[PDB]
Scaffold this active site. Structure first.
Site, short mmCIF file in Angstrom:
data_model
loop_
_atom_site.label_atom_id
_atom_site.label_comp_id
_atom_site.label_asym_id
_atom_site.label_seq_id
_atom_site.Cartn_x
_atom_site.Cartn_y
_atom_site.Cartn_z
N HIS A 40 0.94 5.53 3.38
CA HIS A 40 1.40 4.54 2.42
C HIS A 40 2.83 4.08 2.69
CE1 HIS A 40 3.23 7.65 -0.38
NE2 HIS A 40 3.97 6.61 -0.72
N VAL A 57 26.68 7.67 4.73
CA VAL A 57 27.94 7.92 5.42
C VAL A 57 27.67 8.51 6.79
CG1 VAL A 57 30.05 9.29 5.37
CG2 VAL A 57 29.18 8.29 3.26
N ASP A 84 -3.80 10.21 3.39
CA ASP A 84 -2.48 9.61 3.37
C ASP A 84 -1.59 10.31 4.41
OD1 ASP A 84 -0.35 8.06 2.65
OD2 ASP A 84 -0.03 9.02 0.71
N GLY A 175 10.46 7.52 -3.06
CA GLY A 175 11.46 7.66 -2.03
C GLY A 175 11.32 8.96 -1.27
N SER A 177 8.31 10.15 -0.65
CA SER A 177 7.04 9.92 0.05
C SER A 177 7.11 10.02 1.56
CB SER A 177 6.50 8.55 -0.35
OG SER A 177 6.18 8.56 -1.72
N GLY A 178 6.15 10.73 2.13
CA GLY A 178 6.09 10.92 3.57
C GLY A 178 6.85 12.17 3.98
O1 ZEN Z 1 0.98 6.57 -10.60
C1 ZEN Z 1 1.33 5.96 -9.59
C2 ZEN Z 1 0.20 5.62 -8.63
C3 ZEN Z 1 0.06 6.73 -7.53
C4 ZEN Z 1 -1.12 6.43 -6.56
N1 ZEN Z 1 -2.38 6.12 -7.31
C5 ZEN Z 1 -3.57 6.88 -7.13
C6 ZEN Z 1 -4.77 6.47 -7.76
C7 ZEN Z 1 -5.95 7.22 -7.57
N2 ZEN Z 1 -5.92 8.33 -6.79
C8 ZEN Z 1 -4.79 8.74 -6.18
C9 ZEN Z 1 -3.58 8.03 -6.33
C10 ZEN Z 1 -2.28 5.11 -8.39
C11 ZEN Z 1 -1.16 5.52 -9.38
N3 ZEN Z 1 2.62 5.64 -9.38
C12 ZEN Z 1 3.64 6.04 -10.38
C13 ZEN Z 1 4.71 6.90 -9.66
N4 ZEN Z 1 5.27 6.10 -8.54
S1 ZEN Z 1 6.59 6.80 -7.86
O2 ZEN Z 1 7.52 7.14 -8.92
O3 ZEN Z 1 7.07 5.87 -6.89
C14 ZEN Z 1 6.14 8.30 -7.00
C15 ZEN Z 1 5.87 8.26 -5.62
C16 ZEN Z 1 5.51 9.43 -4.94
C17 ZEN Z 1 5.41 10.65 -5.62
C18 ZEN Z 1 5.05 11.79 -4.93
C19 ZEN Z 1 4.93 13.02 -5.59
CL1 ZEN Z 1 4.43 14.42 -4.66
C20 ZEN Z 1 5.19 13.11 -6.98
C21 ZEN Z 1 5.55 11.96 -7.69
C22 ZEN Z 1 5.65 10.72 -7.01
C23 ZEN Z 1 6.02 9.54 -7.70
C24 ZEN Z 1 4.25 5.74 -7.53
C25 ZEN Z 1 3.11 4.91 -8.19
CA CA Z 2 24.80 10.07 7.54
#
Ligand code: ZEN
Ligand code: CA
Length: 223
Positions: A40, A57, A84, A175, A177-178
């Protein structure tokens, strides 16, 4: 990382930042020319930054290399986040040293209850957004699939694992992620997704790396 601590400088040498004019995702160095991240986090052009602590920095330990080949898992499902995982081949090999080193691929799937280390430059707030300058760290355990599946509002596949706390307060976030989830010296997970950040009963969800060791090696050999 919400509720974590600032990592000691260069104490997570396999951690890389994916930059496209700004930091947008993390990743792990698995060998001198290959990085593993989340599908992603795909972008057509990515500059990989290694040896970083303060991403804003110049400290003197950085190596910035451009991605040559960006390979998403063939079966990455953008709707469910299944598979992913993504591999990035650097345009040139990096200089391995004390601040830039590789992390080992898992030999087996780590058991629930294993303590792991999650790191990143992602959002540090449970509400709102705050991007840190310094790399954040979080010590968190692998949770039983039963608690994972139960807490998740979405379907948790066999290629996903929950790491974190059911009580909330500490979690990965946007942020991160990955980025890496390293347990006992092996990369066991990749920051993938979650419902919110640091919310009670909503632990973060990670790609189960032990399920892709073969695909990783095959892709590396074939590229
Ligand atoms: O709820 C979501 C999406 C996440 C992905 N998604 C699905 C839907 C169905 N199955 C799996 C994932 C749809 C909902 N988001 C809210 C949180 N944001 S985020 O704050 O950018 C984020 C990104 C990565 C994360 C990784 C972790 Cl391990 C924990 C919290 C995280 C939170 C991403 C989108
Ligand atoms: Ca640096």
């Amino acid at each position: 990382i919400v509720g974590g601590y600032t990592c000691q400088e260069n104490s997570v040498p396999y951690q890389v930042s994916l930059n496209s004019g700004y930091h947008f995702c993390g990743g792990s160095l698995i060998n001198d020319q290959w990085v593993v991240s989340a599908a992603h986090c795909y972008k057509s052009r990515i500059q990989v930054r290694l040896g970083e602590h303060n991403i804003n920095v110049l400290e003197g330990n950085e190596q910035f290399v451009n991605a040559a080949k960006i390979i998403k898992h063939p079966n990455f499902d953008r709707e469910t986040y299944n598979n992913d995982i993504m591999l990035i081949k650097l345009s040139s090999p990096v200089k391995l040293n004390a601040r830039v080193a590789t992390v080992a691929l898992p030999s087996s799937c780590a058991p629930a209850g294993t303590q792991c280390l999650i790191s990143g430059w992602g959002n540090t707030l449970s509400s709102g957004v705050n991007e840190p300058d310094l790399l954040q760290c979080l010590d968190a355990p692998l949770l039983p699939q039963a608690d994972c599946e139960a807490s998740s509002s979405f379907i948790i596949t066999d290629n996903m694992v929950c790491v974190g706390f059911l009580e909330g307060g500490k979690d990965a976030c946007q942020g991160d992620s990955g980025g890496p989830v390293v347990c006992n010296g092996e990369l066991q997970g990749i920051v993938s997704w979650g419902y919110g950040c640091a919310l009670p009963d909503n632990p973060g969800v990670y790609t189960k790396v032990c399920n892709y060791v073969d695909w990783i090696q095959d892709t590396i050999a074939a590229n």
